[PDB]
Amino acid sequence: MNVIAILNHMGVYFKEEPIRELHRALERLNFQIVYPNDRDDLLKLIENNARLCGVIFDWDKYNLELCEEISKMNENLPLYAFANTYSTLDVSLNDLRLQISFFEYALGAAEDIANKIKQTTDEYINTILPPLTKALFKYVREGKYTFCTPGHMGGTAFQKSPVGSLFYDFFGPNTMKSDISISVSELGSLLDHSGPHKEAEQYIARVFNADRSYMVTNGTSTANKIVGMYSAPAGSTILIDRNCHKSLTHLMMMSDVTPIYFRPTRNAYGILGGIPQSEFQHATIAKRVKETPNATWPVHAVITNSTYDGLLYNTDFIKKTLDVKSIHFDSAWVPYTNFSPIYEGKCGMSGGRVEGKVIYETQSTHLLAAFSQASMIHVKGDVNEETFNEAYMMHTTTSPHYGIVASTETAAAMMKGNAGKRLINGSIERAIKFRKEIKRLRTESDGWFFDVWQPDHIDTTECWPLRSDSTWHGFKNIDNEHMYLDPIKVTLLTPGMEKDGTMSDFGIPASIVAKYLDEHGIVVEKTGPYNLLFLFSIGIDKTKALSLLRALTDFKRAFDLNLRVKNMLPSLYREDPEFYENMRIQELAQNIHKLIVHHNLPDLMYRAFEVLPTMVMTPYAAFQKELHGMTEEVYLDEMVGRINANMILPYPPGVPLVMPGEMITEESRPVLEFLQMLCEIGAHYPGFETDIHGAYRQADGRYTVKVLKE
Amino acid sequence: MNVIAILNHMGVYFKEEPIRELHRALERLNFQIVYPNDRDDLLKLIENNARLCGVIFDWDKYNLELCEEISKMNENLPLYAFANTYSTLDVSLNDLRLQISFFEYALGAAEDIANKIKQTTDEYINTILPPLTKALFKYVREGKYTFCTPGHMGGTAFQKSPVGSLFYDFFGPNTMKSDISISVSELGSLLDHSGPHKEAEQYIARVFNADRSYMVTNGTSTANKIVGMYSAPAGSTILIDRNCHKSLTHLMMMSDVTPIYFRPTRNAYGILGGIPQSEFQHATIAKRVKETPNATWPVHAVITNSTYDGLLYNTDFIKKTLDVKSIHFDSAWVPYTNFSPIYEGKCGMSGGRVEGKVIYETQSTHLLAAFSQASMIHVKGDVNEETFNEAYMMHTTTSPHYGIVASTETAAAMMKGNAGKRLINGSIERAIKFRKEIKRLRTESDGWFFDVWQPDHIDTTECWPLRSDSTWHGFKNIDNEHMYLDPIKVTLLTPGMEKDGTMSDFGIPASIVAKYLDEHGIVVEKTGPYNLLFLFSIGIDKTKALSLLRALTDFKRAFDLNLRVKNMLPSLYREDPEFYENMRIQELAQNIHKLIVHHNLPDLMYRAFEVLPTMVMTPYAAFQKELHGMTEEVYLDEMVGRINANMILPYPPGVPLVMPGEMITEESRPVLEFLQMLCEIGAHYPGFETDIHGAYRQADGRYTVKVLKE
Amino acid sequence: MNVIAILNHMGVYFKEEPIRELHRALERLNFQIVYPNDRDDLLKLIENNARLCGVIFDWDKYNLELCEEISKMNENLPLYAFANTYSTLDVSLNDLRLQISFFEYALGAAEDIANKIKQTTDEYINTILPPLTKALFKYVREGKYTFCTPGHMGGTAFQKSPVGSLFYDFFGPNTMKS
């Protein structure tokens, strides 16, 4: 932070010479002076460079031309205004709130003015930096504790070791010294929620519109279990989205609870739809309580809001309708709802308390930018603070990393205020630009191209509603004014399926487009049989957009030339030279596509997940048997009529198929048929193997599963 | 890594000029040349500087004088030997294993020789560096994934933000880029234990003498729960050291188990003694099974080996004697046992398997040097790998930090081989030196001084045995050839108690010595009423030893002058100027000491922990009530006859006093008397407050505790 | 292969200063910068000089005036395009097949951008060179076979002989080692 811009020649020595003296005095005080070519260049420098930290200018020549323009960009930026004859305090200025220091052009003033500017900059720096990190830097500068642990002693031991020097040499002293313990007692305490730790909680709780906010450093995996174990008593029944995370299965195995499942809808594509309004209404729930063996009224519900594909609930309706005392919105996908008005009435925290209920959001901070494992628990309502805090303290890491904690606090510091508001606004604007760019290239090229899966026109900047009277989304009998498409989540479609969900004769499975992009280091966020997703973050610049956009036109060009796999996919070639020697990219695509077409994969996959295996015992009940080691393996073929010991998690489509305690019967035979079909279709091409978790491929090529012993 | 030493003038141009040409050629290839004044300076440079990475010398002038000396220090260090007339392959060399490249002094050779040396150094570097970190650096150099998350995009977002720049500016690009996800698929997988992750496990498992080793990144807190939940079935009885960690209480509350406690011995000082041999013998355990309500034969035992004060068990005796199928040595204090022969027969992993039993060590790597939260599970025996691995995967962080994992791997890299063996040997040697230094200063000074708590003579370098025929240790009727003192753990004694455990008229409580050292930034590892501990690590150098040694003589000097608290403890003074205005350091000491003497604190503390509160219900049973919110607060005075809801953990002495479900009665009245006494003695001086966890100081100054409702 | 052409003054510090920083950063990375007097001089340089291996330009000032003209001469030639306000992905570009990397004018970017350009140039070089000659050069750089024949040992014997040095001195190590 040392670049000072100067903008001018004035035509008079009495002005020019003091600025020369000040230039020189400031350079001696370790400032880099930069000189925008013109007024517009200066505004672009500021706009793009946060390291520009002051502007010197002639008051008369520039004040009415600059002051408001700069204040729009950054209201703390130091301005050093030099006066002429007519320079003064005009009544027009009286009403503006500006951060202004007035200075004259004089030789020999730089020493004192520089010292004041230094002090005033430190004052501004001190205001904007968060206090815990500020104190940490001060310790690293001043403190003198020797004869101390950690044994590495500020990384010292790493430097005398070539092997340790590799790790130290990269990270360096500061990184090594920031790994501190409670021996630095003046930073307060996380466990007492005291000092700069309280200041952080209030800052966050106020920013994110929560009653109370906890900082969790082991992800939403851990936030779920802290909320779960406090929330789900033994012997109780819970309503749980059949679309649930594994960490909630691990909770069920550890707690004696009976699940009744909210039942999402699904369309032919396999895209999950929302739990319909009926699922929340007292009459519907009461009926399932009647139909579920040993069920009682639910004590805790967990809803995933939004769905992945951007269907958000009318949360005003849910909070009013769902008659459950404890409602936990796992809102991992929507951490940003407080920051766009388009999400009002469509998020957990929106509005005020819900009388008679505690509402949770658990959020995976790491659709924002933060270190992996950073998660928040946002509580809207009361807990038993002593029992909740004991629950928190029992599940706290053994050695908390002092950076991870600061990384989550500094992630907010970055996104804070205007400039973070303007950053996200910019990304929304470019999202819509890119959307229209795909349409352009679709026009310009002869023959097949990518398309976008979206409404016919997007004349409106919002999360576009999905309506029952529209066909573009492919869902059947959708609720209206219920689901909305987030502009920044861009799905692309590859050739292979019809707008119906029926199959084309010509197809290019998306997995092949991924292999190509993988040779070129470009990662596809998410891929399905014929779909690819791209996220337009604040990362994504003009260089990356051009490289991606160009890479996509290069795929088409290379595909259409029918390049040899040998030439287009050299790393794949090296896996089996003979297998791949003569194959061309279009033949690889044809063969895999023909398999998909023939094996009717989408229909079989759809049907496997539309019925439920039979719950013979609960996951917890089966785990009691496992706890005593009462498990054997059987072959996959032999599994009908047996009680499964493990979750069986196949890829595709990546969601649980059989739970511990469930059994395939005749009612649920399509389950087994899908599984056997996956083993067959995936046995053909090296690099395109079957993948089913919970099934064990024996060295002989047969699959086993774990079952309960009799 | 670029410093090359040259050692010589030879008196002939045909030798000197090529070395000039090579000096210049090497400087142009970015080597720093250094010139030891003499042969001894070179050996000291090598000994102290790992960045010296090559030595050029005249073969004849130096080979018989240098080769073996350097090979003793570092057997990979590149040597570049220049030949004369008599230089050749003498039969005497045939048997030595050396890393030698032979070169001639010639102009113009540096370009090619430098390139070979560069390549040969990279080959050596590549051998010594561990492969996962090596691959990570290569990615950071070569890879080109754009349009990607993490959103911060290699820290890019931090740089445009003064607040984020504070965090980035300190850590920098490399630190920011090493926070990666499984998108970098070529590093293998932790969860599959595959690729460079397997290579790490084998490396560690072989180094630490285990059958199998797991890498845990959430401390031994988490290692305990992974082993616990696999090991302790519901309805079973467990033998557990009444000296247990809180994380094992949190396990008991979560699992339906019945505890029977191994009962340590204790002496008047309050120092824990070992569970006697009788506690392991079948007849003793059988008798407690009879006497314990609803007890069955134990399925799992947890012993803390060693004790803190260095009493190690004959583990050969325990493994042979203790008739329990599952024995878990929580060996957090003894991570280094594999590396000194003095610990043979005295650690969990020593020797081979124990037929018919699984033996665990859980170790807190962070008495070594590693990041906080680093812990290992070392298994000696078989587990059900699928159920154990499912247990591991359920308790794995949400977002693993990729550095923490490398920090534990690089901590081993540092300590590896000879140089890490010589480092620890050096620390043992200095420990004994310092021990004799305290004795010297004790002689030189008139009047009182510090003493060391150790045997009368230490003519032997080992862990000295504590014997029943010796009085120095203060324990009553100790087992012989049972406990040993680790030389590197140095306890110092302050005036105040007699060698009996009886009280002196003159005392200086250790807490006051801590306040002094705290003003000077010096931390005391561990303090008790009249004791202070110092660890002589590989960190501790001559500068730190002198500063500590001098700081200790300065305390005496300043104490004996009776400086004003105002002058000697200015920060304490600022807390209450009026309170402290006229008080001198000796008066502060007197008043606090007189309190200790009068309140007979050691006797009362000793007695509070020698009886056990009555277990009315188990901690788990009480938690069922808490699970339903059935808790109220009562005042401390009102607690006899009530069932405690929380653990009550007082400081001092820092170990549990009452468990959930326990009740103070008449049998255990000294418990309440100690607690009330602590509230009284600690109410006198600002900065010397009472501290009891589980008791809540109300704003009015009264204490409450949580109890079960009736 | 190290001559990079720069074609411009733009009249604004926010553009000119990053290009100054990049000029200097690139010169430190061992590039020779050349400056065509004008657009036509640049096209003649390219047309006549295969050692010109990259062009840096302002996207708006020059893209519609240069892109097609350069693509007619050499379709692998690295272009480093710097963006302004109106710079973006216009539907008109969607159909052209071009080798384009997009970059911004920024101080301190040269170290990373230079490394990417170096890598991208090596990728282009590696595509165009035939693989046997490529492998031969790699051996001459890395391999370490000593105690070997040919007896001349990479021409070594020629250098100690004035008569043999006449033949070696002219051809040199590379010719002798191939």
Author numbering:
A (entry chain A), B (entry chain A): 1 to 366, 368 to 711
C (entry chain A): 1 to 178
Show the paper's wording:
extracellular pH, and works in conjunction with a cognate inner membrane antiporter. excreted by the antiporter in exchange for a new amino acid substrate. that it is a decamer made of two pentameric rings. central pore, with the CTDs at the periphery.
(cryoEM) and combined it with the crystal structures of the individual proteins. and the C-terminal β-sheet of LdcI23. 7.5 Å to 6.2 Å resolution. interacted with LdcI but was not capable of binding to LdcC. whole upon enzyme activation by pH and the binding of LARA. to the incorporation of the LdcI decamer into the LdcI-RavA cage. decameric state upon activation and incorporation into the LdcI-RavA cage.
